């Protein structure tokens, strides 16, 4: 399986350790819910600049300014 | 955040219930690991034919048989 | 440029005409905001089953 | 709805303001065509290096020289 | 590495055999260029409806009479 | 068509030359197998940090510790 996680950096996060927590976490979910083969699980975390992420028609940067 | 899960169906699954468990599990994981706002977490699960998914150069179809 | 639009179908939407509207709408947006090469714009619309799309931890089907 | 836009930066663009126009425009198009929940609209803009984007078998870094 | 190929079906293609060819093709390409590990190469082929694919602001279905 | 390639950089690579080889390689592959139109082929190569890519539940940074 392939899992793509796209998020916006926040408070110096996520750290390398946190990305690892996500990688292992997401992979374990697939195994627990679908009994998938963890060995073949690929995960990619994309960090999007607050200015390149939009929700509701506004950027995350513009939203955090509130 | 946005999470895209791509997987190959098998054994009549994943059922709609298993899909619900994946959405919940990924969303809770984000909230738990990075204190994300579950309300904004979007998840999309794509199901790929076994003849369309390759690993190591072989199709999942040939790998399962 | 490349634009990927993922949505969950509903009420018989989107029809093939509405998909074309999205393709034209997005393509004209890039040329108007960035003056990008209209002829190099690639758009792909993906229709996601209500049970496969989640928002707030719940599937669109549930919502 | 989710919209991913991948482009190659050019002449200083897109600026944070132009990115907002893309996020706004995209979100308005989804509402005008299918009346989707505007608040649930997620938009991600990825800027690709001109040496990492190909078209017609050639990189954008080269095509811009023609 | 992960490779995603999105295309529009036509005249019955791509066949399961042609999909296999794309998987082996892309996979071998990675090994030859960056000597990447074959076993870790994941390939996903998405087949996009001609009414769902647009180029130059025209759907592939309309761009084919 | 559209081809997205996601890989993790390593040992001074991939260079622009190698990225160009990937663009041409994938493009030729599409032309050879499905006679797809070259001009319409879009390829985007993404370079993922070794800490952002996982396989088997371990980041690539970790996997690369072992030869």
UniProtKB/Swiss-Prot annotation, chain C:
- The active site annotation covers 1 (proton acceptor)
Question: Highest taxon of the source?
Answer: Bacteria
Query: What keywords appear on the UniProt entry?
Result: Isomerase
Instruction: Spell out the Gene3D superfamilies in the cross-references.
Output: Macrophage Migration Inhibitory Factor
Q: What is this protein called?
A: Probable tautomerase HP_0924
Pfam families, A to Z: Tautomerase
GO MF terms listed in the record are: isomerase activity
> What EC number(s) does the entry state?
5.3.2.-
Family membership noted in the UniProt record: Belongs to the 4-oxalocrotonate tautomerase family.
What InterPro entries would the database entry show? 4-OT (IPR018191), 4-OT-like_dom (IPR004370), Tautomerase/MIF_sf (IPR014347)
Curated annotation (Swiss-Prot), chain F:
PANTHER family per the UniProt record, alphabetical: 2-HYDROXYMUCONATE TAUTOMERASE, TAUTOMERASE-RELATED
Organism encoding this protein: Helicobacter pylori (strain ATCC 700392 / 26695) (Campylobacter pylori)
Active site at 1
Q: Which cysteines are joined by disulfide bonds?
A: none
Q: Which CDD domains does the record cross-reference, listed alphabetically?
A: 4Oxalocrotonate_Tautomerase
Q: What is this protein called?
A: Probable tautomerase HP_0924
GO MF annotation terms:
isomerase activity
- Top-level lineage group: Bacteria
Q: What keywords does the record list, in alphabetical order? A: Isomerase
Q: Which family does it belong to?
A: Belongs to the 4-oxalocrotonate tautomerase family.
């Amino acid at each position: 399986p392939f899992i793509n996680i796209k998020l916006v950096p926040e408070n110096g996060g996520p750290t390398n350790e946190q990305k690892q927590q996500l990688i292992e976490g997401v992979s374990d979910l697939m195994v627990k819910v679908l009994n998938k083969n963890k060995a073949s699980i690929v995960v990619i975390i994309d960090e999007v600049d607050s200015n390149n992420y939009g929700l509701g028609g506004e950027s995350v940067h513009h939203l955090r300014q509130k």
